[PDB]
Ligand binder design. Sequence first.
Ligand SMILES: [Ca+2]
Length: 202
Amino acid sequence: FDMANIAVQRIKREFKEVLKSEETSKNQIKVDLVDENFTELRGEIAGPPDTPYEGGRYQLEIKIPETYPFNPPKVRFITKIWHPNISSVTGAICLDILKDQWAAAMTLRTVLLSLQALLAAAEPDDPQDAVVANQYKQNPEMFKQTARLWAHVYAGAPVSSPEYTKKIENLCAAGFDRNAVIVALSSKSWDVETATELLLSN
Ligand SMILES: [Ca+2]
């Protein structure tokens, strides 16, 4: 039915804050009510400029705990993304403010802004996704191109590698599920052989 008053009033206040913010007027962040009692929200953030994510928009599932504001929201990327601190499979996020560094003065606005800042500054030595973190460290340029490909396919960003696109359409035309294909190629250094071998393992 209803959450505790302190939680209700905090979410209402923070929701209004996002609605009125310069950041939402500049189309950088937003929040949408999913549930009338404020326990679930949907966020969106713009990819930051001069990153592989630029031009993309990333949707977020936000669940507000009963203990709000003393524990963080649970946040997950709905939009698929290629980033060392986010699971390429589940959208689970590795960020201290969602874990052990939450403070009660933090808000929906500052969480959304911190997630955009995380896109612009990955921490690969404390990763959520080992495969992506390894690629980020061992082959920066391949990482950038892969992240940009995912931004284009999943988040609506304008550009991506023609090479990569051709490999994807090749495997999709061969009868494999497109998401499976993207994942396989992205995880196997874009090598059609090892990616195909992985796809046949299923
Ligand atoms: Ca209740």
